[PDB]
Amino acid sequence: TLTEELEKLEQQITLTLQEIDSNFAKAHRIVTTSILPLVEQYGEHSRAVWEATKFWKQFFEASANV
Amino acid sequence: SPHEHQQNLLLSRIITNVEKLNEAIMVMNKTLQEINIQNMNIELVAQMFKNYQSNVLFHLEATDNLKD
């Protein structure tokens, strides 16, 4: 009973450790999956928006510069 | 007196049986002592498979066991 529970909980600990590793790696996969290309696309479209603002900003600069 | 002679003679055959008996017992204990040495190995292996079954049972019960 004593050594029984010892080995049992020891195996539970090892299993739980492997489970933690699995969840951890799952989060790792999620980030490495497509989050980086997603934000790259976001920044790309944002860059396009800056090209949009590149025109009208000139007029505001002109207003400041008379 | 004659009774005593008869008694001493019976006692003599008794004592001879005693010595033969005990000599056989000496051989018995000696044999078992030699055997004993050839048992601890098996005992160790027995307890090894015992605790193997115990621990694997505990772990199977922990995981999705497939018993009755």
Side-chain angles (χ1 to χ4, degrees):
Chain A
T1 59
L2 303 174
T3 304
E4 298 182 355
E5 290 291 328
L6 173 65
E7 179 60 21
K8 280 174 178 175
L9 299 172
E10 188 67 25
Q11 288 181 356
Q12 287 180 356
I13 287 160
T14 304
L15 183 65
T16 308
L17 183 68
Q18 188 172 359
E19 288 288 328
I20 290 163
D21 177 75
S22 179
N23 296 116
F24 194 87
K26 188 176 178 182
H28 178 81
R29 283 193 299 280
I30 292 162
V31 173
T32 313
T33 295
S34 297
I35 301 302
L36 297 171
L38 181 60
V39 299
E40 282 176 355
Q41 288 175 355
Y42 176 86
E44 187 64 23
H45 292 296
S46 303
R47 189 181 67 81
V49 178
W50 186 74
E51 293 180 353
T53 61
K54 182 64 170 177
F55 180 77
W56 292 96
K57 180 177 180 293
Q58 298 292 321
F59 295 165
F60 294 165
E61 289 177 353
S63 296
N65 297 318
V66 177
Chain B
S1 174
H3 292 281
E4 302 179 352
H5 289 289
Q6 188 71 36
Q7 285 168 352
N8 294 124
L9 292 166
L10 281 173
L11 188 68
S12 297
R13 286 179 83 100
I14 282 165
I15 288 160
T16 304
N17 286 315
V18 174
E19 292 291 325
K20 293 290 289 185
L21 175 73
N22 302 127
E23 283 173 354
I25 291 165
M26 291 294 293
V27 171
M28 189 183 75
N29 189 353
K30 186 173 182 290
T31 302
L32 293 172
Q33 188 68 35
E34 290 179 352
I35 286 158
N36 186 7
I37 288 167
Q38 302 186 358
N39 295 118
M40 292 171 74
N41 298 313
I42 294 160
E43 182 65 28
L44 287 171
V45 169
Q47 295 177 1
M48 285 154 177
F49 286 5
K50 182 181 178 183
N51 286 319
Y52 187 93
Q53 186 64 46
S54 303
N55 290 116
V56 72
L57 174 56
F58 185 64
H59 287 88
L60 286 165
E61 288 173 354
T63 182
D64 290 332
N65 198 351
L66 302 174
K67 65 177 180 178
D68 297 331

